[PDB]
Design an enzyme around this catalytic site. Structure first.
Site, PDB file in Angstrom:
ATOM      1  N   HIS C  88       5.917  49.478 -44.485  1.00  0.00           N
ATOM      2  CA  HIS C  88       5.125  49.356 -43.262  1.00  0.00           C
ATOM      3  C   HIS C  88       3.681  49.738 -43.571  1.00  0.00           C
ATOM      4  CE1 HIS C  88       8.903  49.086 -40.959  1.00  0.00           C
ATOM      5  NE2 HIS C  88       9.311  50.153 -41.619  1.00  0.00           N
ATOM      6  N   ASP C  91      -2.605  48.361 -38.669  1.00  0.00           N
ATOM      7  CA  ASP C  91      -3.840  47.583 -38.482  1.00  0.00           C
ATOM      8  C   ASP C  91      -4.344  48.006 -37.102  1.00  0.00           C
ATOM      9  OD1 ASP C  91      -5.629  45.525 -37.440  1.00  0.00           O
ATOM     10  OD2 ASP C  91      -4.266  43.892 -38.041  1.00  0.00           O
ATOM     11  N   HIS C  93      -7.024  47.399 -34.376  1.00  0.00           N
ATOM     12  CA  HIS C  93      -8.054  46.471 -33.909  1.00  0.00           C
ATOM     13  C   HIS C  93      -9.315  47.230 -33.518  1.00  0.00           C
ATOM     14  CE1 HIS C  93      -5.224  42.930 -32.549  1.00  0.00           C
ATOM     15  NE2 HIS C  93      -4.939  43.365 -33.764  1.00  0.00           N
ATOM     16  N   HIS C 128      -1.134  47.615 -34.696  1.00  0.00           N
ATOM     17  CA  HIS C 128       0.193  47.087 -35.036  1.00  0.00           C
ATOM     18  C   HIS C 128       0.472  47.149 -36.519  1.00  0.00           C
ATOM     19  CE1 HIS C 128      -1.397  43.148 -36.375  1.00  0.00           C
ATOM     20  NE2 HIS C 128      -2.168  43.199 -35.297  1.00  0.00           N
ATOM     21  N   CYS C 129       1.758  47.129 -36.877  1.00  0.00           N
ATOM     22  CA  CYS C 129       2.142  47.021 -38.283  1.00  0.00           C
ATOM     23  C   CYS C 129       1.845  45.590 -38.745  1.00  0.00           C
ATOM     24  CB  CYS C 129       3.618  47.360 -38.467  1.00  0.00           C
ATOM     25  SG  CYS C 129       4.118  47.391 -40.202  1.00  0.00           S
ATOM     26  N   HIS C 138       7.453  42.164 -37.951  1.00  0.00           N
ATOM     27  CA  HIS C 138       7.300  43.596 -37.675  1.00  0.00           C
ATOM     28  C   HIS C 138       6.692  43.811 -36.284  1.00  0.00           C
ATOM     29  CE1 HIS C 138       8.175  45.660 -41.664  1.00  0.00           C
ATOM     30  NE2 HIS C 138       8.504  44.393 -41.838  1.00  0.00           N
ATOM     31  N   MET C 143       6.581  46.999 -33.354  1.00  0.00           N
ATOM     32  CA  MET C 143       5.587  47.862 -34.006  1.00  0.00           C
ATOM     33  C   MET C 143       4.147  47.590 -33.527  1.00  0.00           C
ATOM     34  SD  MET C 143       6.997  48.536 -37.928  1.00  0.00           S
ATOM     35  CE  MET C 143       6.258  50.169 -37.822  1.00  0.00           C
ATOM     36  N   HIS C 248       0.174  41.710 -12.701  1.00  0.00           N
ATOM     37  CA  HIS C 248      -0.025  41.663 -11.250  1.00  0.00           C
ATOM     38  C   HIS C 248       0.681  42.856 -10.600  1.00  0.00           C
ATOM     39  CE1 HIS C 248      -0.116  39.952  -7.151  1.00  0.00           C
ATOM     40  NE2 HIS C 248       1.168  40.253  -7.084  1.00  0.00           N
ATOM     41  N   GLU C 272      -6.189  39.648  -8.170  1.00  0.00           N
ATOM     42  CA  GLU C 272      -4.766  39.541  -7.841  1.00  0.00           C
ATOM     43  C   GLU C 272      -3.927  39.616  -9.133  1.00  0.00           C
ATOM     44  OE1 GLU C 272      -3.677  35.633  -5.997  1.00  0.00           O
ATOM     45  OE2 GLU C 272      -5.577  34.896  -6.856  1.00  0.00           O
ATOM     46  N   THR C 273      -4.353  38.855 -10.134  1.00  0.00           N
ATOM     47  CA  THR C 273      -3.643  38.737 -11.392  1.00  0.00           C
ATOM     48  C   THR C 273      -4.698  38.670 -12.497  1.00  0.00           C
ATOM     49  OG1 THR C 273      -1.801  37.564 -10.276  1.00  0.00           O
ATOM     50  CG2 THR C 273      -1.938  37.291 -12.679  1.00  0.00           C
ATOM     51  N   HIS C 299       3.050  37.736 -14.017  1.00  0.00           N
ATOM     52  CA  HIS C 299       3.171  36.755 -12.925  1.00  0.00           C
ATOM     53  C   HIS C 299       3.493  35.307 -13.333  1.00  0.00           C
ATOM     54  CE1 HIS C 299       3.054  35.319  -8.812  1.00  0.00           C
ATOM     55  NE2 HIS C 299       2.792  36.540  -8.377  1.00  0.00           N
TER      56      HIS C 299
HETATM   57 CU   LIG Z   1       6.265  47.484 -40.094  1.00  0.00          CU
HETATM   58 CU   LIG Z   2       2.898  36.999  -6.306  1.00  0.00          CU
HETATM   59 CU   LIG Z   3      -3.790  42.213 -34.977  1.00  0.00          CU
END
Ligand SMILES: [Cu+2]
Ligand SMILES: [Cu+2]
Ligand SMILES: [Cu+2]
Ligand SMILES: [Cu+2]
Ligand SMILES: [Cu+2]
Ligand SMILES: [Cu+2]
Ligand SMILES: [Zn+2]
Ligand SMILES: [Zn+2]
Ligand SMILES: [Zn+2]
Lengths: 334, 334, 334
Positions: C88, C91, C93, C128-129, C138, C143, C248, C272-273, C299
């Site tokens: 493993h 990363d 971001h 994330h891995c 993964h 992960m 939502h 709303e969303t 939603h």
């Molecule tokens: Cu991993």
């Molecule tokens: Cu709705």
């Molecule tokens: Cu990424």
């Protein structure tokens, strides 16, 4: 009146490069002339030899990027050689009227046409082929690219301060719909016409067989990786004429991003991942700070790693320990 | 206190029209009263005669658009006639509390209910049926529409300058999940209840069989095309209660777009294609500059041309050669 | 120079909670130290007993949320116990260089590593891995989690006025790809390695079998519902490391939303969303005004109700008739 303006003639270049142009400019409006010639051709799209009965502007997926400035007039000669089998045209999303110019540029093999339109809105805009009754097929088979209309005074941040890039790249992402036969292998077609019915059936499932940058799995990797140096600002133009995608630069960011691609709107900053709506082109600036090999990819990681929507950027320069440092390398747990 | 306010009564109209209303207004807040009556019915949804066991507000897909102003109170009588087979209710995304009002409007066939809520936020908002345990089915079967809450002083650009439309249209886009039998033909059901189990199975695949504007392939084409003139500003309200879509006007633009649909946010300008998140309504202004027949479509071109998410707008007026000119019509290559 | 700064040590807590932290702070930059230990394990992901051969940071899906301030340095010890079967890494971001730190944190079972990076950009960021050649697997196996980098002076509205939350929750949404055998039942695997080939095949279809909040259908319901009171402001952090989603709150709104998740950009109001792009984390503030049980969901209502992307928030306090009132309860039609 466009008839009073000086004409200029631009020579196009193949993706991922973009033809030389000015950002901020002291030039007044011009009629900028381009030519593109359509080429239908079978292309190998993956590592195992799958083919696509492809259709292209200028021989490439995507078509080349056209660059003008707001207030210029784009004047395109579209050529459809007699060696092609199908009719074609062009729909510029950057244009106003006549279905983007499609109704005015219907060209059978052996024909050509010249369209002019005023590039009155700043941004990166999709252009694509759109023949009546076969629009999705021509588009998904490779017939799209980007028109970039720069503001006459160049790019600006949300506070109206100047922004620039030192280098521009253009990435077209193509959701492909390659049919399989009873044996589960991809079909290879003798002609473009013979691929049609089977392809429509795959298309209607909405599941691409492949999703590729610039015409092929690995198009922008190895010898063909994009390049930059620490301290250089790159513009990444990303077009997707048919389907949504979510660009991400691994180990990097979108410093300034216009994900809807229209430069009169303020860009967003510090993005991890942005969103290109199917039927649009967007643009991101990034200034490199670390050397190494980055991946630029669609962050549906299945679409990237399994289906092909990923490229590389090789960056030269000096490592910065303040930004990132390996404090303890991998070693046995105490 | 809403009990101190004058009541007004609004008569709804069928999509794609929107009932007469003021934009900027000198009126103070009101209790605005509406009634809707639910109708379950089998509908023909495509050119080959496929049916949907449909559920509707007021007999149409989408339901009619309700228009009020920020600070008004919406007061809806929801009627569920004894001729219907299922229970229903309504969830207003424009509303605060009680699952959008669903918990307060559960109506069996033969029953009705009256809900009031304060429309305290500007924007276009989805409303939809949401009965406990069968929410997706009622929604995908046709039970959604838009509440538009206008700001009391009308629409504004990012600089706070006035914006307006001369004409409003409402487009509901419906991802449909029609089952097939062993013969690969779509199933036709005698009753709404009998469509249920098979439909859930199709739904779980996440692949629509059809994606339609306003209840049917071609609903907004031919005699039923939307209309406008050069110089007129149109508001295009686009709702999608279950799935993402990417509206585009071919040969045109979104001049001012609120893609998330909420008017207290600045709109974006010059869009080629915008994004309506599933479970939302968005709004775009466009001022026509060229006459002709435009397509307004979902720019997943497969979803548009193959599955049905496309309509037409027929625009009257005088052609503008400055915006676009055919310089040389199609003719033999020299 | 990060070597001159005070170190602090943060104890992580399991989702949906987030570890205690300050928003606006008078503290100068620190090196903030965290540890996470990877755990592979079979998990039950639905009501019918389906299992996933899962991979986790700290035993949970999502991994815990890490909170620092802009200008801090994140210093992570990543531990991969000898009881695990796979290599493993991580990363971020939120980080600059070395593929997010993946290239510097490759840990075999029995190994550990320590990465430092400068959290120089505000926002919620996915981590994330990402092991070479097995990235999507993964990630989709569990992960991922969120790094939140708060601005040193706390959150701000579009006019630069202060915003705050009283309570933070973290929701990770996981598109799962569980294989079936000839009998149509989901497969149960003795080891993580044995799930691999079958899972990749499901992944390539792009159709999830399940889409769950926090590791399981109903994870955030019943005894495990999220909680709040009328008048309290909640921050809802929503991460989706692989696929788009559209959050939502039913009966509520996003009062202030950063859907791209980056705090130096103005938030949008009254949503709303909203939209979380696959490969990102976003953040929404909402101040409760009505008591009751709310649903917080994706939603796409099929993805929510059929596939599992839905949770509950139980809210204490006094009902407000001005915001919403049942005028006439369900009763026979006159
Ligand atoms: Cu991993
Ligand atoms: Cu709705
Ligand atoms: Cu990424
Ligand atoms: Cu073509
Ligand atoms: Cu188009
Ligand atoms: Cu209903
Ligand atoms: Zn530069
Ligand atoms: Zn007008
Ligand atoms: Zn508070």
């Amino acid at each position: 009146d466009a008839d009073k303006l000086p004409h200029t003639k631009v020579t196009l270049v193949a993706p991922p490069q973009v033809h030389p142009h000015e950002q901020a400019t002291k030039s007044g409006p011009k009629v900028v002339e381009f030519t593109m010639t359509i080429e239908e051709k079978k292309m190998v799209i993956d590592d195992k030899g799958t083919t696509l009965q492809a259709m292209t502007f200028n021989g490439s997926m995507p078509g080349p990027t056209l660059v003008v400035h707001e207030g210029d007039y784009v004047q395109l000669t579209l050529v459809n050689p007699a060696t092609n089998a199908m009719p074609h045209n062009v729909d510029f999303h950057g244009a106003t009227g006549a279905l983007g110019g499609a109704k005015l540029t219907n060209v059978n093999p052996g024909e050509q046409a010249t369209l002019r339109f005023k590039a009155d809105r700043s941004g990166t805009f999709v252009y694509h082929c759109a023949p009546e009754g076969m629009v999705p097929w021509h588009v998904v088979s490779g017939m799209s690219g980007t028109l970039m209309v720069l503001p006459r005074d160049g790019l600006k941040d949300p506070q109206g301060k100047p922004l620039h890039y030192d280098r521009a790249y253009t990435i077209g992402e193509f959701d492909l719909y390659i049919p399989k036969g009873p044996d589960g292998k991809y079909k290879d077609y003798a002609t473009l016409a013979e691929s049609y019915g089977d392809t429509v059936q795959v298309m209607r499932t909405l599941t691409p067989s492949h999703i590729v940058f610039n015409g092929k799995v690995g198009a922008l990797t190895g010898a063909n990786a994009l390049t930059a140096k620490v301290g250089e600002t790159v513009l990444l133009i990303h077009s997707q004429a048919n389907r949504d995608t979510r660009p991400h630069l691994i180990g990097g960011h979108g410093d300034w991003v216009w994900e809807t691609g229209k430069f009169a709107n303020p860009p967003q900053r510090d993005l991890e991942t942005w969103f290109i709506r199917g039927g649009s082109a967007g643009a991101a600036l990034y200034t490199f700070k670390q050397p190494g090999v980055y991946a630029y990819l669609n962050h549906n990681l299945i679409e990237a790693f399994e289906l092909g929507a990923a490229g590389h950027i090789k960056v030269e320069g000096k490592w910065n320990d303040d930004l990132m440092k390996q404090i303890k390398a991998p070693a046995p747990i105490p």
